[PDB]
């Protein structure tokens, strides 16, 4: 492949996808507040989980139709969802219009964004994925502040209109996904399940799906933990700045260095990104000083980066460019449920003991189990 | 060409363009009213005239870029114009955002919609143009009532958002323009002016440009004339129904029958539309009865249909499928000024004498002169 040229354009488009999806999701809570201030928590998770739960279908549509058509359709559906959100005034139409439309369109627009990078970059696929991931991370962490500032000025409908504008620009950028590689019986044709005929992929996906609960618990619950335990410190934005900076840096660096790792050995990066996190999840209760929290945030971002930034290229390397959309889609589908179920269970455990210690101690285990499971994949 | 199949799909898309552009323009006045009701004319004409005045540049793109790219870009610009209209709250930013953006995007999206029809239909080009024109007419005369109903319910920003999603669907449909036939020095390359090397095209375009003032005066000024002179009749919607029905019927019929006329003889149809209308324009200040007004409306619609519905295929026939975008664009550009200037001059004439008699008498002449000019084009 070119490993450059028009590929870089695609990278930009890919970035505009990720940061504009997750970022918008990061704003959901703010939007909820808006609603309350105009009328004086599960739909937000449903819409976000629809990105990964519906990915297996997007994989089929990507193998059959293509990256461009699927991405454009998903972007159009997301635009329509945000549009009808701007128009709807209800608590039942909001659920349908946001979740079923916007999240599904996000899934359809998000699945092909990695397969296209795989189309254009082979030797420098890791670096392109790292660029996309770092840009997406920065944009996602920056979006909610802009949404809050808009809320201070305009109402909810206008905000939904701006989000639909973001989705519109996304769909326009999605047309740069120019194909570069070739492309009851119908039920068995669409669900052949050929990637699950390889032990390496099976065990890799199983480990990644097993790690997700405890992988995602700390990131959601750190802010609440610091707010509860540490009430006498006012510089809480330092934590966010540290996490974001180190996470973007780690994403870029991991994407770069994953290219120099010959074969399946890059899987080892992921284990470390699960090992330390695991261990880190069991030392958050032990932090008595601000500096300890800062160090934990640095390590949290470092662990966050590698996982995603190589999970994409490792998915492309395990099975090949042909069976890459399917592998990515089913990895995402398997991760869909545990990631959503984790933080809820962490909160439930917190409510049953009055402290986050047990929640973090239990969330530190699944990542370690996943790391141990993944450690044995490169050995065969 | 196919003269069918996917071409019909294009026809639908083409329809969605025309009816959705002109219809939206027909709503401008209503929008203005809403603005006043929230704060208690030239901009509307400028935005509409940008469709035809800017067509020569759209012709240059359509021949170097293509119908699909130009149509999508124009639709995107129109969407952005309606968006920023929904957001802006001012009397100077409104002018820019509506006129310069929406009208120019409408020009860019509207010019290729005829060239693509010519691409797909050659032997049945007239019928496709007639279908597009009839659907466009019905949609245009149906839009303002729906806009009024929406205004009675929601505010101006939401109405602009609805128009924006109309433009969005238009842009989505404009991707079905798949090409079917091939595609200081740069200044002379873009402005070669080769269609003007043909005397037939020169005289045809000159006659069509000369007729426009008086061609378009009666349609705008008939409602005002009946409101002023006929104040004792309350069934004024019968006039609109007659005009719309007969105009759509005439568009379809003229488009269908122009295919049976071998060569340049179809130009004669246009001269009839210029002759009768002329005479009709001179007989409006002679109707003492409601039935006479109904007959005049029927004849007005009949004259309206043929002109447009054959102006497209005759433009394609005079110069060929290669120099068709250029011919259409420059015919539109030449028509741009007189069509805008006409009704204003008719109103100015009405003011200075206290009645519409002289205005209609003067507006009846330019169409007759254009008919006489065009009569001699098929003779050589
Ligand atoms: C309830 C839900 C309802 C859902 C409704 C359905 C939604 C989805 C429907 C559409 C999805 C279907 C697939 C879409 C089509 C994708 C494929 C396709 O058509 O081809 C793509 C086409 C080309 O694809 P192609 O495949 O034909 O390319 C040709 C390749 N060969 C020859 C091999 C076949 O892409 C384009 O070329 C279009 C380019 C348009 C450029 C647009 C530029 C816009 C610039 C805007 C600037 C605005 C800012 C300016 C502001 C100024 C302010 C001052
Ligand atoms: C490895 C990385 C860990 C971080 C991360 O995963 C990746 O986890 C996600 C959770 C997100 C936060 C959720 C809620 C809020 C509160 C909101 O509060 C308004 C202001 C406030 C004070 O003024 C009240 O007014 C501001 C935004 C913020 C902090 C989000 C930022 C982005 C975050 C950190 C996301 C990011 C992708
Ligand atoms: C055949 C030719 C094609 C072009 C053309 O005909 C000639 O197409 C016609 C459509 C007309 C509009 C239709 C409807 C309305 C609503 C009305 O609302 C008053 C109140 C009422 C509810 O609307 C209830 O009493 C105001 C006028 C307006 C905007 C017309 C303006 C003139 C227009 C644009 C005409 C235009 C010259
Ligand atoms: C609300 O309940 C939950 C919330 C979350 C949030 O926590 C994270 C997180 O830690 C990491 C991501 C990254 O995910 C990716 C996956 C990919 O495959 C590719 C990528 O480019 C990305 C990134 O860009 C994303 O930043 C996303 C999120 C969720 C909010 O964005 C997780 C689990 C939950 O249950
Ligand atoms: C406000 O000042 C003016 C207003 C008007 C309005 O009167 C007409 C009219 O009589 C006919 C059209 C048709 O024009 C076309 C031209 C084409 O090349 C192809 C087509 O498909 C169409 C049609 O669909 C249109 O219906 C448009 C309009 C204007 C409002 O729509 C004219 C001159 C003015 O100065």
Question: What is the gist of this entry?
Answer:
Chains A, B: Keywords: Acetylation, Cell membrane, Disease variant, Membrane, Transmembrane, Transmembrane helix, Transport. By secondary structure, chain A is mainly α. The first copy, chain A, has 17 helices and no strands.
Question: In the CATH classification, which architecture of the largest domain in chain A applies?
Answer: Up-down Bundle
Q: Tell me the structural class of chain A.
A: mainly alpha
Sheet-strand content of chain A, in percent, reads under 5%
The beta-strand count of chain A equals: 0
> What Rg of chain A do the Cα atoms give?
20 Å
Membrane topology (chains A, B): Multi-pass membrane protein
Catalytic activity (chains A, B): 3,3',5-triiodo-L-thyronine(out) = 3,3',5-triiodo-L-thyronine(in); L-thyroxine(out) = L-thyroxine(in); 3,3',5'-triiodo-L-thyronine(out) = 3,3',5'-triiodo-L-thyronine(in); 3,3'-diiodo-L-thyronine(out) = 3,3'-diiodo-L-thyronine(in)
Keywords (chains A, B): Acetylation, Cell membrane, Disease variant, Membrane, Transmembrane, Transmembrane helix, Transport
Organism (chains A, B): Homo sapiens
Task: Describe the model.
Chains A, B: Keywords: Acetylation, Cell membrane, Disease variant, Membrane, Transmembrane, Transmembrane helix, Transport. Chains A, B: The chain crosses the membrane at residues 4-24, 41-61, 69-89, 98-118, 127-147, 156-176, 203-223, 237-257, 267-287, 290-310, 328-348, 358-378. Chains A, B: It catalyses: 3,3',5-triiodo-L-thyronine(out) = 3,3',5-triiodo-L-thyronine(in); L-thyroxine(out) = L-thyroxine(in); 3,3',5'-triiodo-L-thyronine(out) = 3,3',5'-triiodo-L-thyronine(in); 3,3'-diiodo-L-thyronine(out) = 3,3'-diiodo-L-thyronine(in). Chains A, B: This is Monocarboxylate transporter 8. Two copies of one chain form a homodimer. Chain A is mostly helical. The first copy, chain A, has two domains: 6-175, MFS general substrate transporter like domains (Growth Hormone, Chain: A); 195-375, Up-down Bundle (Growth Hormone, Chain: A), CATH 1.20.1250. The first copy, chain A, has helices at residues 6-26, 28-38, 43-53, 55-64, 67-87, 93-110, 112-120, 125-153, 156-173, 185-190, 199-229, 237-257, 267-281, 290-319, 325-353, 357-363, 365-375. In chain A, helix 3 (43-53) runs antiparallel to helix 15 (325-353). The A-B interface holds A 76, 79, 83, 86-87, 157-158, 161, 165, 168, 172 and B 76, 79, 83, 86-87, 157-158, 161, 165, 168, 172. One copy of the ligand C[C@@H]1CC[C@@]2(OC1)O[C@H]1C[C@H]3[C@@H]4CC=C5C[C@@H](OCCC(CO)CO)CC[C@]5(C)[C@H]4CC[C@]3(C)[C@H]1[C@@H]2C is lined by residues 26, 29, 140-141, 144, 148, 219, 240, 243, 247, 301, 304 of chain A.
